[PDB]
TrEMBL record, chains A, B, C:
Pyruvate binds at R93, T95. This is RidA family protein. PANTHER family: PTHR47328, RUTC FAMILY PROTEIN YOAB (PTHR47328:SF1). It holds the Pfam family Ribonuc_L-PSP. It comes from Pseudomonas aeruginosa. CDD domains: YjgF_YER057c_UK114_like_2. The lineage of its organism: Bacteria, Pseudomonadati, Pseudomonadota, Gammaproteobacteria, Pseudomonadales. Gene3D superfamilies: RutC-like (3.30.1330.40).
Amino acid sequence: MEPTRIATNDRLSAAVCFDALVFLSGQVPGQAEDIHGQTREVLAKIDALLAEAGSRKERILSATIYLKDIARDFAALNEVWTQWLPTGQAPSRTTVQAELARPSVLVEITVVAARG
Amino acid sequence: MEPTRIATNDRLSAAVCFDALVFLSGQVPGQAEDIHGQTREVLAKIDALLAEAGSRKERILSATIYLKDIARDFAALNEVWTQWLPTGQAPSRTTVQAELARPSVLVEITVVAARG
Amino acid sequence: MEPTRIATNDRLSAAVCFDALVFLSGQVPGQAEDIHGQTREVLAKIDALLAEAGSRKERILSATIYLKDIARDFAALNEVWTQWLPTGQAPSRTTVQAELARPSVLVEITVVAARG
């Protein structure tokens, strides 16, 4: 087996697929400025990438959720997250505080999923 | 193949199993307040989840260890960790500083393991 | 299937291999003191470990890149990273800020790869 790549540039591929596994690059928000909208936009991008990479939201295996300010933003994160997930099909997850590459980014999520 | 889930709520599943792989949610301490006891309790929970998910401590593949204060607590973390691991069967690991969802949490560990 | 281990000590194995997957411990620099040289040395070590673990740079699936100061050092990190990667074969990646176990460490990278 060979890895296949999705949306490759000279730093990263949005997705790498290998042996029924899908490895997504950490996804960042669009132009939203607030935690609620940024979380929605991050999840929208993951939704799209899963489709391109041959998976779907129901097949997420793990998610690391990085919050620039975990004390300030965890509740809002959980609100959008819990509403976006398919019912009863939540993945394994870890949420931790970390500054992201751009100061405006409040949230970034890194997903591994099962090809479907 | 379909992913199977263990102890699912509307945010996360404690474990997700797919194709001989086990993805655990980041595990946090019980009611211990000190680094030594918190690390022991985190490892106890991982021990339990591996059992439920069809793996065991000898079959851990990777561990990300998050410490709220890596300078202050790394030595104690290593002490409990090295004693808990089955001899000669340490997994791949990465230990980094990150604040966790609750301020009382000094340590959180995210494990991927092989089904056995 | 059984996991096999590479360069095991009582805290971690440099690599764990299981079912065509390679899990590397987070790699830290040698004695370089600057971000550019530290990033080069981290990538050199990963290069070596991939060889020992039966993979290669072209087969990296995911990389988490930890920077002690993401604002200060991301540009230099990207410079060395983009030059080291095999052309058109970048993996999935996530770059976040986190303090590492030693204060001198500016960068640490955790890789999962496909056995080849």
